Every structure is written in C-alpha cells, then in structure tokens.
Design a protein around this ligand. Structure first.
Ligand SMILES: C=CC1=C(C)/C(=C/C2=[NH+]C(=C\c3[nH]c(/C=C4\NC(=O)[C@@H](C)\C4=C/C)c(C)c3CCC(=O)O)/C(CCC(=O)O)=C2C)NC1=O
Ligand SMILES: C=CC1=C(C)/C(=C/C2=[NH+]C(=C\c3[nH]c(/C=C4\NC(=O)[C@@H](C)\C4=C/C)c(C)c3CCC(=O)O)/C(CCC(=O)O)=C2C)NC1=O
Lengths: 496, 496
C-alpha cells in the first residue's frame, strides 16, 4: 500500500529540540496570539507571578504593571522579528520579563533575578573586559585558550572547554580549564552525531544556551499547541526551553548539574563552542547572558577573520610554488623529469606520503612504489573516462593477500593530458595513527539507563570507529592546487 | 643581505601617524613599564587629575584611588595583550580610565565624563540599538543608508556619511544623513591620497577614531622616547592619539569642528568608512565609542557576507554561461563557428560593443566589423609577443581624418591558441563619463617655512571632470572570465 517509509534508523538525532512544549522551572513562560490574546502559559505562572494569564484573554496592568505593557504593546504593534526584556518587581520580588516573537507567536519568558544585586551584576564589567581582550588575540589557538581560562575566572563554573569542529563535524576538546580535582577532558574527540543537526541549527541561530539544573522538572506549557496553527509553539529563540532527556542523561553521567554554552559561528556554520559545566546548580542573571551573546557575535567575527587570513596565506604560498614548478618545466629540456625531480616537483606542492608521475607510458614513483595503485585507479576511471580529476580519502587499500597490500587509502589524481595518459597522483596513508593521542576517560559511574555511550569514553570509542581507515582528508586548498596544476600542465602539453 | 632600504613611492605615505608623541587635550595619558614603573606622561595630568606623575615612580592610591590600581595591577600581572576600563571619580571630576598594552608598554588614558547623563550612556543598551539595526538589512545600499540614519539619530552629529573605496583606492560618498541646512556631499568622489596607505593600514588595526575638537592643541608626552628602547611609543591603539595636523587642516577646510569615524574592513582590506562631523566641538562618552567598536566588527562581517554573496552569484552565472559555450564548441565541427554566432558565443560572455574571433588566419566580426582593429592590435602585440592577454579601456585613437579610424577605446583580447595565432577580441566604444570631484583635484603642494607641505585642497566645491576616450572599464570579473575562457579554449585546441 503505502509504498514508502521515511528514514527512521536513528533514535535521537531526530528528537525535535526546538518544539518540546516544556520549560525550565527557574522561570515561567507566557505565550500570546499575534493580536495579544493569551494562548498558553507555563503553569508555574501563579507560583512566581501571583496571577494567572487566563488563555483566551488579555493581560492587565494590575497583573504585570505598565512597565511590561509598554514593551508588549510596542511588540504587538511592531512588525518583523521582535525581542526585548524589562526590569520590574512582581509581588514581593524582582523579575526579568523577557519576550520575543517567532512565526507569528509572541512569547513572554519570566526569569527570576532575585537574591542577586547590582554588585553581583558587576559581572557586566568582567564581560566587557572579556569583549575588550579577545579582539587582539592573533590566532585561534591562543584565543580559544585565553578565553577558556578567563571565562572560568569570571563565571566560576567548575569546568570550561573549547570545542573546535572539523570538516566532518567531529569535535575536539582543544582547550580546557577545570577545578583541579576534576578529570581533564583536554584532547577528547567525538563524532558529529554528538551534536545533532537540529542542535547544530539552534547553536548557529541562537548564540546562547543556559541550563539551570539538569535535575529540573520541566514546566509543561498548556495548552500544548497554538490554537491558530493547531501546531507546536516554536521555542527556537526562547531561553527557558526544555533540554533533551538524552543530553540531561549525558550530563548526569558526567555528574554535571548546570551548563552554559557560547556559540562561535563562521561562514554560517557552527565553527566552535565554549561549553561551561558546574557540578552543582548554577544560574546567571539575564543581563550578563546578553553580554555573552554580544561576546559570541564579536568572537565569531574575529575567528572568521583569522581563518580567512590563514587560508589566503596557504593559497598564496602554494601559488608561488606552483608557478616556480611551471617555470622550471617550461624552461627545462623535459617536462617529465622536471615534474618528478625531488628538489621541486609535484611531491612538494601537496602534502602527501608519496607521488607518482605518468606520461607517454613513462612512470615514476616518488617516496615509494605506487604503480599498482595508479593502475588500479585508472582501471576504476576506465569505467568513467570522462572524469578529469579524482580523489578519495577512503580508497579500498590493497589486501593483505600480497605484498601489493599497502596503506595508501588516500589518493588525489589529475588527468593532465588524456591523449597520452598524462597523469599525476598523490597518496596518503591512514590518519588515525598520527592523531591517536586523546587519552580514553575512565570515570567510575552508576551509569544511566542508556549505558556507557552517553559518557566521554563512549563518545571517544565511537569516534575512533568513524575515522578508522580514512586518510588525512584532502583540503579544499589541496583540491584547488590540483585543479590549477592540471591547467598549468595543459599549456605545456599544448605548446609541446 | 639586501644592502638597501626600500623607497616609498610618495611622501604622502611617509608621515608616521602612529608615533606623534602627543595626545588630544580632552584627556591625559600615563605610560608605564611592564612592572608599572612610570615611563612617560602627558603634561596635563595635574591640570586634570591633580597630581604629577614622575618617571621611575609608581602610581599610588593617593593619586588614582584603589579602582584604578586594581585595574592596572590586574593588567600588569596578566599575560599577553591587555585592555580594560573602569568608571571612577578623581578630584571632583568623574573619569573614564582606559587601559591597554601594546608592544610591551602599558598605557592609562583618562577621559572626563563631565556633565553627561549616566543612564543613557549605558554601553550595552547602545550596542543593542545598532546591532539590532545592522542585522535587518539585505543589501549594502539599504544597510549603509539606514545605518547612517541610526548613527546620526544616536550621536546627533551634524553629518554622517558612508564612504566607499574604489579599485584605485579613490572613494565615493555612497550615503549621507545631515542637518537640513547643510550642503549634501552624496555621490562626490575623493582622490585616493585623501586617506594614505598607512592610515588605511592603521584603520584596519584600530576600528575607531574620534577628534573632540579639530582646533585642539596636542598635549605633548614627555619624554618622547621610551628609555627601554630609545624609540617612540607606538600609540596606534591609544584613544587620545593626536590625529595628523594635515587631516586637521583638511577638516578645517571642510569647516568641521569635531570628527568620528568607524572602519569597515572586508577581506583584510579597508573597504569603507562611516564618518561623522559636527560643526561645533563634540565628545562621545567612552562606553558609546566601545559600543561602536563592537558595531564596527559586526558590520564589517555582515558587509563581507553580503559582498561575497553578490560576487559569488555573478561568478556562478558567468561560469554557467562559459561552460554552456564550451559544450556548444566541443559539440561543433569547427570551434571557429560555434564561437561566433549570437546563440551564446563569445559576445554573450562579457558586456561588449563588438567582438572578433580569429584562428588559423580566419577572422569573423560580431556586432560590427573589426578586422582593422584586430590586425593593428596584433601587429602592436608583436612588441610583447610572450603576452597572452591584453586589455585596455583607453586605446589611443587615431587622428580625425576619417571615421575609418580605429577609435574603439575598449579592447580585451586573449591568445588562446598561439600555435595558430588563435585570438579572441571584445570591444567597447567610448563612454562619455562625468565625475563630480569633491573639490578640484589640484596639486597637493604649497611651499612655506616647512618647504613643500602636502596641503589639502583649497575648497570642496563639487568640480566636474568630463571623461572622454574611455570605455566602461573591464571589470575584474570580466578579466577572470576572459582568463577562464582562455584556459577552456586552450584545452579545446589541445584536443583539436
Ligand atoms: C568528551 C565528552 C563529550 C561530551 C561532554 C559531549 C557532550 C555534548 N552534547 C552536546 C549537545 C547535545 N547533544 C545532544 C544529543 C545527543 N548527544 C550525543 O552524544 C548523542 C548520543 C545524541 C543524540 C544523537 C543534544 C540534543 C544536544 C543539544 C542539547 C541542548 O543544547 O539542549 C554538546 C554540545 C553542547 C554542550 O556543550 O552541551 C556536547 C559537548 N560529547 C562528548 O564527546
Ligand atoms: C568628505 C570627504 C572626506 C574624506 C575623503 C575624508 C577622508 C579621511 N582621511 C582620513 C585620514 C587621514 N588623511 C590623511 C592625509 C591626507 N588627506 C588628504 O586629504 C591629503 C591632504 C593627505 C595627505 C597628503 C592622514 C594623514 C590621515 C590620518 C589621520 C590620523 O588618524 O591622524 C580620515 C580618517 C580620520 C577621520 O575620521 O576624520 C578620513 C575620514 N574625510 C572626509 O570628510
């Protein structure tokens, strides 16, 4: 009948974290139709605010004061995206009342900001010092290190870690600061599934996340669906949003009780995170988290400028080498020897564990003997001979049935002159042996029902599973270099 | 090694604006060794702070209070760069005290925040306004427009301008907001030497300048040379830095009394500026200038994103046309046929008033008849026969004796198959063009007791230059397209 079935092998990369319908109980949620009518609220509204915003009705100044209604009625008469907060005392004690809009729904988030003070809010001066410092760090390694230190100096979280994401969305704990009795996680690596593509999108779109108590009871917002759409409230930009039970379990295995993380975005991609953990409940006043959102935007712009400045230098140096190669082959008595010569040749341009030159049936292998792999890739490309350039980081290595076997799973190949079997190859061995230096963590636990994968060791062992057999991946600069060299060689083939 | 010192191209670039040895008098400067020993001071400290700083002493709590010494000593005991600021009262004045370190020297800068509203000067709520504004714009035209409006609304400067650099480092006022009775500078161009190379480099480093009164007298800092080095104090990052006397003369000839400007940096180049003028002295509290320093980076990142998205779209469409042309040519019996006819063909790739295809001694003309010009250019190109690409917008016209003259100013040509004199041409006729210079670009020289001063223009009257004998310039994208077509047709001739 149905003749189709959605992709459903995964368990919990698809659990939708932007529309959970549940709230962190250190605050309260109220949700409004675009006219202003109350549609749903978190049921702790009475416990914190002393009033019920009755669904199907409107707020009153005798509930929220005028201060909130200035904001909301400039909101309700506003257009496009909206976001604001206001300072007030509700009943006996102080609140931050925070609000935004998304997909025609207007949201009110009430966060407690009581038993803390302007003196404590001197954290605003610390955040502005962090913002002033980062703008002058000269590389991303020192930037991430110093920020990971000073974030902890400021906030007093038990741990802070800098994550950096690789081309495959795997992550590495590239820097750490910790309370010294706690185990270090420096140099851990984890698979891309550790941050599912929805959390990817939310950390790109929503610079700050705060988790006040991993042991929280989630406040059910009621009614559960917006009566106008008859669909879930999209909480993507809220702050009180329910954490996924999977990540609460993962943090409970780590023994974490509260979290804050600060996004770094580059090129519209999640380039990194700072992640802060504390082993007992912790809460940060909203005015400070606004300053960390500002910090996230500043840091993202700085990192993106540094990484673009690095890539431009890579492409510069490679171009200046390749033009010398072209010059030498044009001036010399032979192209083929000038390609294979160790002092300047194809083996110098691209990082490789070996290189092979092929032209007119002549072949040479540099740093090894690769005429087997060259033949085998040609026999693969003989199934698609219109392909000009081929590369892989995961070639099926020659088997142990013969000394023809060997580690060259990385191949990069140029057809520079199809009419005389002019080819160039570069090769790479398997990566993992070079990088195998993250120590496996060992924390003794009463492990949660999901089992040991929701732990740093589980994640590390599941990461090695992912990189087994892969070479060091061919960089976009490497591919650009091969692309350009092909066309430099064609000019010599043409004039020869 | 080199045994010679590089010579600068023009004395415009020689003035070392980073080492004036003086500050603007609306504040004071103290400079300290890495252990906090005083090295040099501005001459006005007692006139402003009430005490004399002596080199070789240390700043004492009786002089600056505990908040400053806490800030400074938390600086000195830090690692790497430092910058911080604190709000404090000294004598009767409220001060902003701004600290930074650069090239192993520590600086303390004092700004009086006298007679201003402590509430509305809150840094974070100022940053909120502009950063909420910038992120709502979909293109650089509306971005620079409404940002220039919000900048004027916030600061109350008499004029704000968006200034955009050209490929020759000239620049043009692309947006403005002004007091109603003032002249409008919108659309005028200004020659490249109005912002010298070293100024543009410094403004890539330091995003914000302010001049509180263009009429100021610099407060010298004594001693002028740092005893640790006997070199000048590099003031590149100081906020009180004495702006160049030449630029103060420039703004005096504009009739401006106070200035602020904000860098826009894209791709590691100074891409443009926001610049602000007031016809009376004006000073902006440091928290607001800090919020503009943040805005400078967020705006630069967003301008970079928008311009990358535009150029990438142009590249996409052009590459699709180039490959469609290659598909036609490779699938045609004569390349020289499929190149010519208006069903795509060469004339479709680049905006041109004429084109010609030449190969093997054949010629064809498109949108006209160009064998005369082509022959003349190729005979001229025998003077540089290794050259494979030639272009001009200013082909030197013949005398008026006949319209047989090869008057076509715009020529672009590529040698795609030298072995058969394979040449392609694109042409553009003259475009009569008009430039409103902001002041006539007279020679920037006056002779006096200093010798020849590089004096700015005598007035800023809009003076029109009428440009004739030029085509529309060949764009860098046009040249990139010609290059890629050259390589594609080199491949195709290599097979043919
Ligand atoms: C070496 C130690 C180590 C640690 C501590 C580690 C944890 C980790 N979880 C993160 C986030 C999330 N993960 C999941 C879901 C799942 N997490 C998985 O691993 C798989 C099984 C799974 C689903 C397929 C979700 C929904 C979120 C978003 C939660 C939210 O923000 O509401 C992040 C980034 C943010 C942060 O720092 O908390 C980190 C760093 N990963 C490691 O390797
Ligand atoms: C309406 C149009 C308009 C334009 C085009 C404009 C340009 C401009 N020049 C700037 C900087 C400098 N220019 C020069 C020197 C030269 N300038 C010239 O004209 C010739 C005579 C000359 C040398 C032979 C120097 C040394 C500096 C560094 C100053 C310092 O930082 O000490 C700045 C940034 C400063 C600011 O915010 O005001 C701007 C915004 N200002 C306008 O209002």
């Amino acid at each position: 009948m149905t003749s189709i079935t959605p992709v459903t092998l995964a368990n919990c990369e698809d659990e939708p974290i932007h529309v959970p319908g549940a709230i962190q109980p250190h605050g309260a949620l109220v949700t409004l139709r675009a006219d202003g009518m109350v549609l749903a609220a978190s049921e702790n509204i009475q416990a914190l605010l002393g009033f019920v915003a009755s669904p199907g009705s409107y707020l009153t100044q005798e509930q929220v004061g005028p201060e909130v209604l200035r904001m909301l009625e400039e909101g309700l008469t506003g257009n496009g995206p909206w976001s604001n907060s206001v300072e007030t005392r509700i009943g006996e004690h102080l609140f931050d009342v925070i609000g935004h809009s998304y997909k025609e729904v207007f949201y009110l988030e009430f966060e407690i900001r009581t038993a803390d003070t302007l003196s404590i809010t001197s954290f605003t001066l610390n955040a502005q010092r962090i913002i002033a410092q980062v703008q002058l760090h000269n590389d991303t390694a020192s930037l991430l290190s110093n920020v990971t230190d000073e974030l902890r100096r400021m906030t007093g979280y038990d741990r802070v870690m800098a994550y950096r994401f690789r081309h495959d969305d795997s992550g590495e704990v590239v820097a750490e600061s910790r309370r010294e009795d706690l185990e270090s996680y420096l140099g851990q690596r984890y698979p891309a599934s550790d941050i599912p593509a929805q959390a990817r999108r939310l950390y790109i779109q929503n610079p700050i996340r705060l988790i006040a108590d991993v042991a929280y009871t989630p406040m059910r917002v009621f009614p559960a669906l917006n009566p106008e759409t008859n669909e879930s409230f999209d909480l993507s930009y809220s702050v009180l949003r329910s954490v996924s039970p999977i990540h609460c379990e993962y943090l409970t295995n780590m023994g974490v009780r509260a979290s804050m993380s600060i996004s770094i975005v580059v090129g519209g991609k999640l380039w990194g995170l700072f992640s802060c953990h504390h082993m007992s409940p912790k809460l940060i006043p909203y005015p400070v988290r606004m300053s960390f959102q500002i910090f996230s935007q500043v840091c993202s712009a700085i990192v993106e400028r540094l990484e673009q400045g690095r890539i431009a230098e890579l492409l510069r140096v490679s171009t200046e080498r390749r033009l010398a190669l072209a010059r030498r082959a044009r001036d010399a008595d032979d192209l083929f020897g000038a390609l294979a010569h160790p002092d300047d040749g194809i083996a110098a341009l691209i990082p490789c564990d070996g290189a092979l030159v092929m032209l007119g049936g002549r072949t040479l292998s540099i740093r090894g003997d690769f005429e087997r792999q060259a033949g085998n890739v040609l026999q693969r490309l003989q199934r698609d001979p219109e392909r000009d350039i081929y590369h892989t980081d995961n070639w099926p290595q020659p088997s142990e049935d013969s000394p023809d076997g060997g580690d060259c799973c990385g191949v990069l190949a140029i057809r520079f002159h199809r009419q005389e079997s002019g080819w160039i190859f570069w090769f790479r061995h398997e990566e993992v042996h070079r990088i195998r230096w993250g120590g496996k963590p060992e924390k003794l636990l009463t492990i949660g029902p999901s089992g040991p994968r929701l732990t740093p060791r589980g994640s590390f062992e599941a990461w090695e599973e992912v990189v087994r057999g892969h070479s060091t991946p061919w960089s976009e600069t490497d591919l650009a270099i091969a692309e350009k060299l092909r066309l430099d060689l064609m000019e010599l083939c043409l004039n020869h």
